[PDB]
Amino acid sequence: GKAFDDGAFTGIREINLSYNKETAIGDFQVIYDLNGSPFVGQNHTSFITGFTPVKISLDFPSEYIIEVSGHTGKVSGYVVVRSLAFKTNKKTYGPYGVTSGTPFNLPIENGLIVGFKGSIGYWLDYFSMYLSL
Amino acid sequence: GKAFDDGAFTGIREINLSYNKETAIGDFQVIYDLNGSPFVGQNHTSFITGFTPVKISLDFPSEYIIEVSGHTGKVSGYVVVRSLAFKTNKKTYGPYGVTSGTPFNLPIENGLIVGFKGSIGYWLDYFSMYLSL
Amino acid sequence: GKAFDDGAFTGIREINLSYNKETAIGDFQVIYDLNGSPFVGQNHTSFITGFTPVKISLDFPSEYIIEVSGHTGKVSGYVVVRSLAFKTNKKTYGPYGVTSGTPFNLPIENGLIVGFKGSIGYWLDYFSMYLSL
């Protein structure tokens, strides 16, 4: 798939992703905070369509992500990110996608997510997160 | 004076400031790096005119600031930043302004300047710097 | 269990843990690096015995942990850490314990693990990791 790397920012205001309940995560885009103003991240898009979009609008800065979880597994022979859930100090968004395969979870005891990178082909192949104090 | 706070970024590409050889630093503006692309900081301008502009265009990222120095002292009764010099791993830019008063200097042995904040009235009243790895 | 918190250091030299292939992780102790010299962390001991000890001696600083993975699940009604595995840039140590239950994994793309905290009763109840640049 096509690699993407948003780099690091001040915080997160909004996550726009899409998913298919028979396959996996598709599109991924983030509106970051940058020193108190929104910064609109590039739209990272799947090679294909048929996905369901969801907008995750956080009440930044009082609301922030405290755990990211989901599943990885094979779709059409490819290891991909099948589902994602975002837990904030206020509520849980998701899970979006297919909740099967190998679970993963990243609880954050101290710190903040401030950036995303990864790769998307037909589906989100993988992703990583920037963390800071 | 009017306070300003650019916040923090990935690095520094360019500094545009102005000075007067009888008073102090006037205008101050920075083009930051933000994850590989320029981010144009707000122009922070003196209340008055008569300054001489200088453009400090750094060869980012191979060229970066390793020491900031200058002078503070009283002008028309106000404590202000009277001169600034920026030393990089390649060259020295400055001093600009009046090299009289109390010297200060910040050498950076490990780390990077990634942001500026301060206040400007007739002259640059004060400033601080964001530091990171 | 009895909570522990080693805090943060400058790196990791050795991990001493024990496990039982029928239950979970028991004892846990770390020899940290502290500014170039070993710092011997406190022994955190299970309430019971019968564990198999293992010594993970890293080639510090050339060798460092790049992923920690494991399993959590219930033993005698308690949610505990049932297995741990430590992957470095050189080799894999483990898994130790019982690889049953919910998997977790923390790959580090940039940065270092420099500390552990957690709790141990009969077995390791939970743990967290300090991360830094």
């Binding site: 490819y78 290891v79 990178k117 | 690095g11 | 940065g111």
Partner: peptide
């Protein structure tokens, strides 16, 4: 020194490449 700020990155989760 790279001239660019660094931050901790965790991951990746998903395909390993």
């Amino acid at each position: 020194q790279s001239g660019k700020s660094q931050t901790v990155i965790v991951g990746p989760w998903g395909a390993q490449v």
